[PDB]
Design a protein around this ligand. Structure first.
Ligand SMILES: Cc1cc2nc3c(=O)[nH]c(=O)nc-3n(C[C@H](O)[C@H](O)[C@H](O)COP(=O)(O)OP(=O)(O)OC[C@H]3O[C@@H](n4cnc5c(N)ncnc54)[C@H](O)[C@@H]3O)c2cc1C
Ligand SMILES: NC(=O)c1ccc[n+]([C@@H]2O[C@H](COP(=O)([O-])OP(=O)(O)OC[C@H]3O[C@@H](n4cnc5c(N)ncnc54)[C@H](O)[C@@H]3O)[C@@H](O)[C@H]2O)c1
Length: 271
């Protein structure tokens, strides 16, 4: 195989920022060079990395979930929302690591470590999911997967979606319900709709927004029972249901409604 970057999850690897693209008003794609154009990251599908830096006198470590893969030689892509200072009344300082990243110049470096996470997608419908950090993975193969993502919670979902669509022999059908605050907050919309246009048989796409625009053909509001019933596969088909987003989205919007619809806890996983 190609040379792997992340050889031990406790080792730190400083990677150089080589590109940055605006995703929307507050979110960006940050691309970092791997140690050589021929290296791969070493990232089982579904796992994340951690970035670390000393910021204003404190150690700051944060996980980010690459949207690229081990097919992508020489680089790694992160999609990261910046939490700006002087914007939200409850958080006047903004976010530490995200603003630090936003301030980086091309050529600056930051330390990566990983990979980590309880879920690994092994292809052709097969998921290896550890109950916790100290247990063996349980191998669950499914015909379909429900995905509930809020905001930047789209990142692990997009890793899994892209891995599936690349393999013409992977017949797994993904049903994504993607929640954001407003229409302009819908991250990577062109990418998602390109995936729908090209893989409609394996990819079902639905949105909800807190605040909807005039003409809107999808859903509005926090994730609810109706959305889960109509836009994720039915419990009878025993799909896995994956969730990723703000903790209250998971706690108050997803879990009780997955219960109402009839998806058993055993079939559900939160990143
Ligand atoms: C396993 C895992 C993977 C993750 N992967 C990703 C990823 O791929 N991409 C990604 O963007 N994030 C990801 N997150 C979140 C990420 O780890 C950080 O929590 C996030 O970047 C914020 O960290 P911070 O240092 O910038 O903010 P902090 O200083 O730690 O905390 C600030 C918090 O206050 C709130 N806040 C501050 N300013 C504002 C503002 N202007 N508007 C609204 N709220 C505000 C936010 O809740 C914010 O998190 C992931 C989290 C986990 C647990
Ligand atoms: N564990 C992981 O692997 C992982 C990966 C990526 C992101 N995340 C998390 O996802 C979150 C993304 O934050 P964001 O700023 O992009 O989200 P956000 O504030 O823009 O909210 C996005 C959507 O989340 C839902 N939501 C927000 N607050 C809610 C509430 N109180 N009740 C019900 N639903 C609510 C809404 O549908 C909302 O539109 C962060 O908490 C981040 O840590 C986790």
């Amino acid at each position: 195989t190609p040379a792997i970057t992340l050889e031990n999850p406790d080792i730190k690897y400083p990677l150089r920022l080589i590109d940055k693209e605006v995703v929307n008003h507050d979110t960006r794609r940050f691309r970092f060079a791997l140690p050589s154009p021929e290296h791969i990251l070493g990232l089982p599908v579904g796992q994340h990395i951690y970035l670390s830096a000393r910021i204003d006198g404190n150690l700051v470590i944060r996980p980010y979930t690459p949207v690229s893969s081990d097919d992508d030689k020489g680089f790694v892509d992160l999609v990261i929302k910046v939490y700006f200072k002087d914007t939200h009344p409850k958080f006047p300082a903004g976010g530490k690591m995200s603003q630090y990243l936003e301030s980086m110049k091309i050529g600056d470096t930051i330390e990566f470590r990983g990979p980590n996470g309880l879920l690994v997608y092994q292809g052709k419908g097969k998921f290896a999911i550890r109950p916790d950090k100290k247990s063996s993975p349980v191998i669950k193969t499914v015909k379909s997967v429900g995905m509930i993502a809020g905001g930047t919670g789209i990142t692990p979902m997009l890793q899994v979606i892209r891995a599936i669509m690349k393999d013409p022999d992977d017949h797994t059908v993904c049903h994504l319900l993607f929640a954001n605050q407003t229409e302009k907050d819908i991250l990577l919309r062109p990418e998602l709709e390109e995936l729908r246009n090209e893989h409609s048989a394996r990819f079902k796409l639905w949105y909800t927004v807190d605040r909807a625009p005039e003409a809107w053909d999808y859903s509005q509001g926090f994730v609810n029972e109706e959305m889960i019933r109509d836009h994720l596969p039915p419990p009878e088909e025993e799909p896995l249901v994956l969730m990723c987003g703000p903790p209250p989205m998971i706690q108050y919007a997803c879990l009780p409604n997955l219960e109402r619809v009839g998806h058993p806890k055993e079939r559900c996983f939160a990143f």
